[PDB]
């Protein structure tokens, strides 16, 4: 059994001196007893596969990038969140009536979960006026005002979270103004998150669950205390 396997793998074991000595000694003992497109190591072809992450749609969110400005996190085949980097704001008040939204209980629970994860993942968020929201009728509209060192700014923390959440295709909109350490700066004044219906938007990057799953561990890791009894 092992003799055949050794016979198959002959070309790769000549260079060893011990193998040559063993072969020569075996031959001598037998004789004396009779007297009385990418190929590696010559045999390994380099092959590839690409995973179709879309098939995970029923059990986990999938994020993808359409272009610099538009990105999506889809939940199933019916709903999702459109995230837009933009200079055009759609909310011009300072309210975010989260408690009333919860009391009314009209929103999609999965989408509210994703909003909560995003917001809880922002590091060092400390300017509540920078976040405005509209939840009337169960819709979800969230507007982060990125206007203004760049490291200690709401814009940087929001953009770090956005980069992770829409990982893959986020970078094209990001780090135009290269900052100190890991800090991010862009030319956009607002990040807007609104619900949307399902459509194939993934022109720039393949849909993927990686960003969301990774962000799950970031929740609450870098939130500031705002009262003594949380």
């Amino acid at each position, epitope marked *: 059994g092992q003799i055949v396997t050794f016979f198959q793998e002959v070309p790769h074991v000549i260079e060893e001196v011990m193998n040559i000595v063993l072969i020569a000694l075996s031959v001598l003992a037998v004789l004396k007893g009779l007297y009385n497109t990418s190929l590696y190591k010559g045999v390994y072809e380099l092959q590839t596969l690409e995973l179709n992450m879309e098939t995970l749609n029923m059990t986990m969110p999938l994020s993808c990038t359409k272009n*610099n*400005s538009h990105h999506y996190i889809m939940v199933g085949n019916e709903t999702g969140l459109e995230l837009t980097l933009t200079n*055009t704001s*759609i909310i*011009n008040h300072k309210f975010c009536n989260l408690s009333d939204a919860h009391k009314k209980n009209l929103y999609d629970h999965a989408l509210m979960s994703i909003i909560s994860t995003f917001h809880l993942s922002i590091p060092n968020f400390n300017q509540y006026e920078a976040m405005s929201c509209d939840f009337n009728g169960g819709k979800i509209s969230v507007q982060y005002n990125l206007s203004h060192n760049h490291c200690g700014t709401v814009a940087n923390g929001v953009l770090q979270t956005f980069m992770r959440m829409a990982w893959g295709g986020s970078y094209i909109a990001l780090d135009s103004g290269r900052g100190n350490w890991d800090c991010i700066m862009t030319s956009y*004044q607002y990040l807007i998150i609104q619900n949307t219906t399902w459509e194939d938007h993934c022109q720039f990057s393949r849909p993927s669950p990686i960003g969301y799953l990774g962000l799950l561990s970031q929740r609450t890791r870098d939130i500031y205390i705002s009262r003594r009894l949380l």
Partner: antibody
Amino acid sequence: QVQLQESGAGLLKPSETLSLSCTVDGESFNGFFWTWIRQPPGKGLEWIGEINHLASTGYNPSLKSRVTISVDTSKNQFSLKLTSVTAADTAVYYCARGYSYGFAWPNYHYLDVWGKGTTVTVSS
Amino acid sequence: EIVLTQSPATLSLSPGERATLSCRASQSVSSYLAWYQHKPGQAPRLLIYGASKRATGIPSRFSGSGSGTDFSLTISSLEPEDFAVYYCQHRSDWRTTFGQGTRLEI
């Protein structure tokens, strides 16, 4: 094909309140800034204000205290209220559909669909 | 707040002549200006937007250019129906402002 139909009385006396309404038929109501503009006689165009489908509004400062703009998404209309109108408020009033593009530079904004316009005069 | 000053106050030109109108902003623009044509008895009509893009139904003789604080509208060979009052308009976030207007007459 989009039409904006304006309704509202144009014959007023001073200290009354002007009420104008504009109904949109054609294309979506969201993603636009529904806008009120006016031209006083012998003057140029003047932005009164704007509102979007989330009821967020922007007003001209010189009129902020007196101007209110509202929407009704059920019948795709938006309304302008001007309180305590004086002789300086005589003008032609237009409603318009505004679109703002801020996703890439150069950003742009325009008013592409306009209503007919309503003359409003205040006198004794 | 950004304000727009138009130049000149009025223009006197013949049909077939080249018309050039300027709009100067008090600071670098939040977004590129747009240009409207207005005649008595009707609503203003969007001519140009993004400082250089023709709107629907606008003849190719209408062109625009500019950036920063300087913008211009050009009518290469002006037709008799091009005589009207022209406005530049700008929008910063939730604040729209108009130029004072330029009168183009024969």
